Design an enzyme around this catalytic site. Sequence first.
Site, PDB file in Angstrom:
ATOM      1  N   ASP A  35       5.867-102.476 -13.327  1.00 23.89           N
ATOM      2  CA  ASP A  35       6.128-101.216 -14.018  1.00 23.89           C
ATOM      3  C   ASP A  35       6.227-100.073 -13.014  1.00 23.89           C
ATOM      4  O   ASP A  35       5.205 -99.543 -12.560  1.00 23.89           O
ATOM      5  CB  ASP A  35       5.000-100.955 -14.997  1.00 23.89           C
ATOM      6  CG  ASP A  35       5.200 -99.679 -15.778  1.00 23.89           C
ATOM      7  OD1 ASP A  35       6.302 -99.106 -15.716  1.00 23.89           O
ATOM      8  OD2 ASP A  35       4.243 -99.246 -16.454  1.00 23.89           O
ATOM      9  N   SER A 199      20.345 -87.787 -11.998  1.00 25.17           N
ATOM     10  CA  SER A 199      21.677 -88.334 -12.165  1.00 25.17           C
ATOM     11  C   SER A 199      22.687 -87.194 -12.213  1.00 25.17           C
ATOM     12  O   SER A 199      22.388 -86.088 -12.665  1.00 25.17           O
ATOM     13  CB  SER A 199      21.729 -89.145 -13.463  1.00 25.17           C
ATOM     14  OG  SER A 199      23.040 -89.549 -13.778  1.00 25.17           O
TER      15      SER A 199
END
Length: 330
Positions: A35, A199
């Site tokens: 994770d 992004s």
Amino acid sequence: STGSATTTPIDSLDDAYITPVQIGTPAQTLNLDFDTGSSDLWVFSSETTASEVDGQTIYTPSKSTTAKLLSGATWSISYGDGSSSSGDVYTDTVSVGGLTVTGQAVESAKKVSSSFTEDSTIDGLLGLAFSTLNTVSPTQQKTFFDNAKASLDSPVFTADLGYHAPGTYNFGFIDTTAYTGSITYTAVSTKQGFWEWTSTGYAVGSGTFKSTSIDGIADTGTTLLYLPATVVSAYWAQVSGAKSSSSVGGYVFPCSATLPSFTFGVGSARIVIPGDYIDFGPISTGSSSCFGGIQSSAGIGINIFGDVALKAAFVVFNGATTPTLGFASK
């Protein structure tokens, strides 16, 4: 040193991936959920409340000649999905794919929430976010990667998650045969303890690319792709009959639909998520309403590039003094 381990989807939907981890001496192999959005290595154990164990493999520290109680240490964690676990702490030898760390903090669960009990395939979590998020008190502990870093050939790990198939976690090296083209690296903020990046935009299907900054985290422990409501609405508007269902808890779509791809930007590069990766199947057995793999992050407080996005790429988690992320197509 290096390590390399195969990671395997837990079910036919890729809801999560499990990676075998050797703990203790002799080794006890547990299948952990790696994770990159958390920083605790915790396991089902011989200390876990018996009624909260249902099929998981447990770590028994009393059977490990290298286990040592970390005296006074406790841990307690709550995840973004509302699940939680807590317990005490041992140090022990932990190996992943041939890479060994001695003195790793292994957080033994005394209590786990129902979602963990109900998932017999996941024996615990191995956190790969920054150690500043580790919950051990009163002495915060380091992640497996943080402990291994100095020994690694290069201070990196890579995630290469499969679509409906196994993939690979590598530590200490870049497998240049595992991706196409080049890797585009992008800046990371560690201020929230995550692999947080920005992004450069998105496209829906064959549509034009929208240049827009989308800050979010690279999180292998989250199944879906959580993005701003504007972006998510633009995606689902291209699927006839798709709608947000408050009762189901997100966007659903007719199972008869063919889903468009979704592209996200990494600098000037582009990662394409095929439409099929966005199908999470019937909302309940036999239903013709299917659950979408792109969902709104409104109310979560952060955008999350979970497995839906990451499995479309070869992803480099560069833990150099100034961390960065890399993405390549594959």
